């Protein structure tokens, strides 16, 4: 029976019932979390998977195309970490750094940033497409400042 | 209220928690248990602390936090102010009221 984000993707109309079952059974056989499997296999669009992830995982979701690039916090995360992981550092508030992730089940990436920054790291969902494009966009805007 | 949200902000702390300074054009967080999708067009009636005027904001959803979210984070939607004189006016009043408070360390409804 169809549970988790697989069920939510059905209720959202993003995927067929039998495809959701087959994905779910496959992920279970691989011992891989459902959102990771769905992203890897591209069963639905990134924004659809982000939408189902947000409601089922209880997480906030940001359209970063409306974020003011000039307020990004990319420079708090080293170039190495930004290629090791596929995350989009967003914005700092006090001892908190909000980090865009597209997989609700990142741990290494958030913990690495936690150790590198000595900040408290809060994940915010951002769909996988936007993280790819926007990180590059924001690196270009940061570079225009110099260095 | 058939697709018309409303938000009344009675003091400066309420406005601080609601305001979204990193949104292009400005944005405002509106508590609601209804699930919205990023990109949805919404109409908001926004009351600010300085007066009883209800400000019409025809904006786009750029942020969602779901019902039963992980922590003490309120369910609702972040609404981008539209391009145009009506939107910039709203942003301008807000940024005056919160002067020196936006780079505060105090947590908001969003970030």
Residue numbers in the entry:
A (entry chain A): 11 to 157
B (entry chain C): 7 to 117
Question: Which passages does the manuscript contain on this structure?
Answer:
Type IV pili (T4P) are thin and flexible filaments found on the surface of a wide range of Gram-negative bacteria that undergo cycles of extension and retraction and participate in a variety of important functions related to lifestyle, defense and pathogenesis. T4P filaments are produced by the polymerization of pilin subunits in a process that depends on PilB, a hexameric ATPase associated with the bacterial inner membrane, while pilus retraction is powered by another hexameric ATPase, PilT. In Xanthomonas citri, two cytosolic proteins, PilZ and the c-di-GMP receptor FimX, are involved in the regulation of T4P biogenesis through interactions with PilB.
Native and selenomethionine PilB12-163-PilZ complexes were crystallized as described in Materials and Methods, in space group P21. Initial phases were estimated by single wavelength anomalous dispersion. The asymmetric unit contains two copies of the PilB12-163-PilZ complex (chains AC and chains BD) and the overall structure of the heterodimeric complex is shown in Fig 1G and 1H. PilB12-163 is made up of two sub-domains, a four helix ND0 (α1-α4) and an α/β ND1 (a β1-β3 antiparallel β-sheet surrounded by three helices (α5-α7) and a string of three consecutive short 310 helices (η1-η3)). The most significant difference between these three PilZ structures is that the electron density for the last 11 PilZ residues (residues 107–117) is well-defined in the PilB12-163-PilZ complex, while no density is observed for these residues for PilZ alone and in the FimXEAL-PilZ complex. These C-terminal residues (called motif V, or MV) are highly conserved in X. citri PilZ orthologs, including PilZPA2960 from P. aeruginosa, and are required for the interaction with PilB but not with FimXEAL. Specifically, in the PilB12-163-PilZ complex, the carboxylate group of the C-terminal Met117 residue of PilZ makes a salt bridge with highly conserved Arg103 of PilB while the Met117 side chain fits into a hydrophobic pocket made up of PilB residues Leu72, Phe77, Leu100, Phe101, Phe108 and Ile134 and conserved PilZ residues Phe28 and Trp69. In both GspE-GspL and EpsEND1-EpsL structures, the PilM homolog (GspL or EpsL) binds to a surface of the PilB homolog (GspE or EpsE) which we name the PilM interface of PilB. Importantly, the PilM interface does not overlap with the PilB surface to which X. citri PilZ binds (called the PilZ interface in Figs 2E and S13).
